[PDB]
Design a protein around this ligand. Structure first.
Ligand SMILES: Cc1cc2nc3c(=O)[nH]c(=O)nc-3n(C[C@H](O)[C@H](O)[C@H](O)COP(=O)(O)O)c2cc1C
Ligand SMILES: Cc1cc2nc3c(=O)[nH]c(=O)nc-3n(C[C@H](O)[C@H](O)[C@H](O)COP(=O)(O)O)c2cc1C
Ligand SMILES: Cc1cc2nc3c(=O)[nH]c(=O)nc-3n(C[C@H](O)[C@H](O)[C@H](O)COP(=O)(O)O)c2cc1C
Lengths: 162, 162, 162, 162, 162, 162, 162, 162, 162, 162, 162, 162
């Protein structure tokens, strides 16, 4: 009802569910919804597919660049929860190592609200030691790592209540 | 099992469900799946979001132009059913009046298999006389008009059996 | 005074009068004025020539695409009258057959307010049977067809009162 | 001898015969020959392949746009016959419904001379009800529909005599 | 009747009246009409909106560059009057100081016929000392400055008689 | 506190101080701050370097063109002082001669508030007669010429009080 | 029946007959047909006009570049005859002097099968000494020079039998 | 003989040896050879220099993007060994930290076969602590790190046997 | 007086004299003057530098391509003399071997009037055997080779008299 | 011998003599020669036509922009004379009014050496009052105005001696 | 005096101080100054704003790419100190993990001189565990981390003395 | 030791050995090394792969064009030997016939030092009469033709000694 939730989409084909998830959130209590995309995510989701379901901003690296300022960092501050779903190995690896080189990773690293991450990758990657350690680091950040999607957004909304 | 189905996507935001529908069809009996997009549909679905679920071709006007030939018309001939879902007012209006100016409308007008159409538009358009008459014309073509999505593909698969 | 009027411009050289008409409307009672252009209309009118006289939006297909959403359909809903003046043979033919492939035709087909159309073409086209039938269809839509420009906007403003 | 004939080419591969037909006409009595192409026709014929055989204009949508004015409509007025050969389903459908959205359809709808049309399409389209009705409409226009190419231009030249 | 008049358009929104003025002149005695545009004027008028009313040339900086030669200077020589209407502060300032950096200013400075100028600007500029002095300089050139549009073209046509 | 100040930046390397000056003004009483750039100034300052310190608009010629309207002239009207700092020889020369060919010069010539100018150039230019006369003209305009930067903005803020 | 024939097209307007010739060959015994174009030939023939009649490859310099490898040289090796028809003066001159700077000349110089060449040029070139000598050189290569088109392809098919 | 080997090339000038190495492998027992390039590697090797020696795919980020799907991940699965040679500091650092942001790093992190890495960098980097730790991490992945090129491919082929 | 002369310019820096030579010819008896440029010549001469002195056509490869037809070959036929001055080694080599791959070489090889050539190159090229033989071939063509510029055009004008 | 001379070229067709003049200067005593072009001058002279005769820099606005710094102002300081020949009305007007908006005008206004200007324009401009006054202003600058080209460079070289 | 210092600028708005800092260094003892920018830094600083104060090179990724070679690595070797100020979270994270994917990170990782880093970020990032660990890693590299700008360059100059 | 050698690379895949050969030469006595590429060679070698091994210039047609002047001809003059290795059929054919249309062929034809050529082509071309004659012509030029690569550069270095 009174919640501002920011949804982040990574370069996984699962992010085609973005518009469906945004509608699920919109067609429920969520007051403000924001969506941010990594560059790779834009090969699987278009911003025009998200805008009809998103009463906040739909942010890409190009959108934020041409607008100037740091509107994404304002949105991080204004969020009661930030969800990265799907979260690719690459995005998890960047967050785990503090390398915020796009708008999605900058939003997460600027956020002080609960952060829920939903890793998605082939299990030929999810058991690799380097990925295990990244999940360890992400969890030391205080982030919630939901291994292995409506269940994910339920946990985010609960955390956003407090 | 032994069926070749071609799915067509129109410039409605509902066509973001394309990849989910293609996976539903793929994760079932369908043997060959093809997908064709109108130019306007590409603002809502990317071809890269469809390709992982489509063991046939993913066709756009640009894809077919640069390849040369009429591969879409070969695919129409090889199809046991053609589904347009969603079908915009514009696409319904073009088919209803024999104006096949893109690959999607050319596939439908070349097809001799069952054709199932799923109109999607605001009801401020669906009760307009011109749209009613277009649906009359589409139905005189022998096309199945499913007013007002898994139910739609079920009817297509039944017709494709005979 | 309390009226929202949307003016649509077609690919006829007569649409160079757009800015003059918008000023006439603005320099009178009209409360909100919107203007939409077909792609062909943009070879005869620039958006920058309209903006100084238009306190609402000036919409083209490119403007609406990059903005995302359906702001033109919101504007159709918010309009007390929609005027297409000039209305080319091509635009009349598309409306008459329910083929809304640009923002102007989508606005008209989404509108539930009075719609006034001002055909403009060489009389070598206006007596062609196909054009006569299109005008028949447009008039069955409930649209007001003003054969053969201030008089046109007067009729629109009267209808918008009720 | 004293005749001005305008030849129109549609997006069918048969329009590669354009240059051969223009030479046949040129290498005979025809006094002025003009040629107009639809955008789709330009994937099958180049203007440079036509110009050596055409003592009038070779018109495309881009040619006419950059030149300004309506030189194609002047050419329609100056023609003693207009031939569309090949005429695609799409072009026939547009003419049949009064939607002149390119230079070829504008020339036909502006012409007051005899108009001869040569449909070309797969018979999976030519027996479709919507195409049958379009041919009915084209023939109510007074156009000569030559179902199912030198024979076509012979009929055009006879009509141009009166 | 026997007069050649060149009309120049500046980067003021008033130059949208260009096509209407050209038709007024054309729909009267004027024998040859030419039109030239500054680059800024092209954000308010298109050349395609002028060409149907202009039996001479419609000149822009790009048109003249790609054509080569100085066709605009030939047109200045062939003119019985040159009208700049509207004349922006910038164009007045350039003429007043002999800086002909575009085709419009080159036409005026090459002309030996009567030159009529119609300043248009917000009165926050027209009382500025620098603009007053520019008008002084323009008038020392022998130009007719019509402070503060059919009346303007009437004065030009009278001067062109002698 | 209650002041609207517009800062203009010219094509001098000194305009890299723009962001620092905007922060100095912002980190003080100034209520609304606007910034406008000449095209040459954009080789030394980016708009993204200014936006974080500017609670009004950051205007370039391209920004204003694509937005349509004259938002810069609205901003001139709404300003209690306009500062050009640095002011190049070229910009001083244009203002001095009433040639407002970009957004910065248009803002100054439209402004009725105090105008403070800070010339910056090599003294091989500042003693040239033509530049001396331009400063004479600028000062006859009522502009404050601060020969030969915080001191400049102090004078502007004092004048803006009345 | 069992023959692989490669047809090469040069920058002569006669190469518009390419699609007609390819259909003649296809609508006969020829088993594999390949077509290669010089860059200049592409101003007279499009690849999309050839592809429907060509069951092998349609090769241009750009096609081969982006594909990588030397697929044209594989096709030369696999050919039972190579026909250049029309063969321009420029292409004849390059072959005659061993300068294979495009895909067409590389195919001929790599071919070990019979090579049939059909010169086409104005007789103001065909009697020039330099062209006579080039034909001498081409014929010393073992190539068949058919001075001065179905007859040409008949000779090629006979040679391909042995 | 029966082995599928994938060779990866990084942005080191040493990757100009790629084509020579691919020929060495091809001119030996290797059955299927694939090559993948990082974006930086393409300033030192062209894909056209590799294709003649590579009977599998030559993959770049652009190649895979436009093709859609994950053909590189299929190739990782089908490989009996993956060699990165040369492996830059940047590529080693990305693999070491699970950041697969290009096709080369995605292939390695998806591979379940032996992975052999050949670091190449100035020793001013190879003794840096951060690089030492990356090599530690790479070796904990089970990768073979060949400090400090035919010897490297020999070790890969031995591992691929089992 | 009654002569049509075509001047050709090659990629030598000496062709900057083109405009001066065209004026010399124009400021004398020459009735029609045409100028053609090789692509390399356009790095040393612009067409806009020639047009003011040339009452015929100024032809480049791009000019002729976009115009369609063979206007250069018409100009060759209409010429009483063709001069190539300067003539580079490359252009001499192409003519000598019948390789007319640009508009300049096509004009010469189509011309039946006297042809005068003025070689210009470093003497490190003019004594090379291959260049000597090319001059032998050019002279067997009947061309006049003026080893080693007003004197050259005098010889051309004398030959053009007969 | 020991002199550094900078030659400036304006947008007059006379600047095609630039390369000839630079060679005349080079083929004499001049030690360092620099050349600068206005943007309009580049439609009549190419930089590649000047470079072979210029042992200093050949400067355009684009050259200086991409290089950064003010190399043209360094060259002004290092010059013993600066010649503008031809000097257009526009360039004279800019210098006369202190508006150095390109590299050529910046060089002149930065120069402390003798400056020689050679006006070139149609006498329909040279007797205009505004141009007369500009020449008055140029001469008050201390510049030498050579009304109405080797004679011009002789005067410059004499002044450069002192 | 005898020192070569390389200054690196990251994608923080603080890097607009780059030109001011370079002038401070230049207007002091520093003998050679170099500046390198990350791609993101170029949205806040232009190279043209730095060049006037930098007697060495101003390096970007594009500059180094087009020049070829590794001039940045030569500059790293020639430096007595390298300062990254501001250093973003992203750049710190890359250095901390040995991922030198741009010219700035390559310069630091190649440098054997003292390296001083000035982190700049919102404290919502500087207390994140992943950033703390990166600073730990940077400091294990021997780098000087100046938490939380003239003071920073003072420490760099002291270290460069030894 | 004291030798300047220029290496030329043709459009053969063998030119990928360019960087290895340049290093072999550099890692030996050669004092100055230059490298020039044909346009086709750039699909197989990048300039950035050569620059690290080349202490002279790496020249392409685009490099030389944008630089102006004839730096390649200066390099030809300064060379003690010029090697073309590999030399394609096309490049051999051009040299053999004096057609220097790119920088590589211009360097060879300008060179007065020993010239060593290493033909590389499929033997389906090397026994063609036209290629045999080209080798005859190349050898009459005094060039050394090394039929059928370190051995080639050894012969060049021996000749360069005298
Ligand atoms: C956000 C958005 C949603 C739209 N949804 C629909 C829709 O659901 N049904 C429809 O007929 N048109 C819809 N339109 C309008 C169509 O996109 C438009 O008519 C288009 O030209 C259809 O093109 P196509 O039928 O060739 O795909 C929508 C437009 C926008 C901007
Ligand atoms: C073919 C041609 C020749 C011209 N010749 C002159 C000339 O001789 N003198 C002049 O003042 N302007 C001449 N002009 C107009 C100038 O090019 C125009 O004023 C231009 O903007 C000058 O720019 P610049 O002074 O910055 O070089 C000519 C224009 C054209 C198209
Ligand atoms: C993959 C490939 C390899 C080639 N190898 C050769 C070759 O080894 N020798 C040759 O003469 N031509 C070869 N060619 C053809 C040449 O690239 C072609 O003739 C080109 O225009 C030569 O240009 P250049 O001599 O100006 O560099 C090859 C072409 C391709 C696509």
């Amino acid at each position: 009802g009174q919640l501002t939730l920011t949804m982040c989409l990574s370069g996984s084909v699962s992010s085609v569910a973005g518009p469906h998830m945004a509608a699920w959130l919109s067609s429920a209590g969520v007051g403000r919804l924001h969506v941010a995309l990594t560059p790779s995510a834009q090969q699987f989701v278009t911003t025009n597919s998200l805008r009809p379901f998103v009463n906040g901003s739909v942010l890409t690296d190009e959108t934020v660049w041409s607008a100037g300022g740091a509107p994404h960092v304002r949105i991080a501050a204004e969020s009661d929860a930030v969800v990265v779903a799907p979260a690719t190995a690459a995005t998890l690896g960047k967050l785990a190592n503090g390398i915020c080189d796009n708008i999605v990773t900058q939003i997460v690293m600027a956020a002080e609200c609960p952060v829920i991450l939903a890793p998605v990758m082939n299990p030929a990657m999810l058991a690799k030691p380097a990925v295990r350690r990244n999940l360890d680091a992400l969890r030391a950040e205080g982030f919630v790592v939901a291994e292995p999607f409506r269940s994910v957004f339920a946990v985010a909304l609960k955390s956003a209540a407090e």
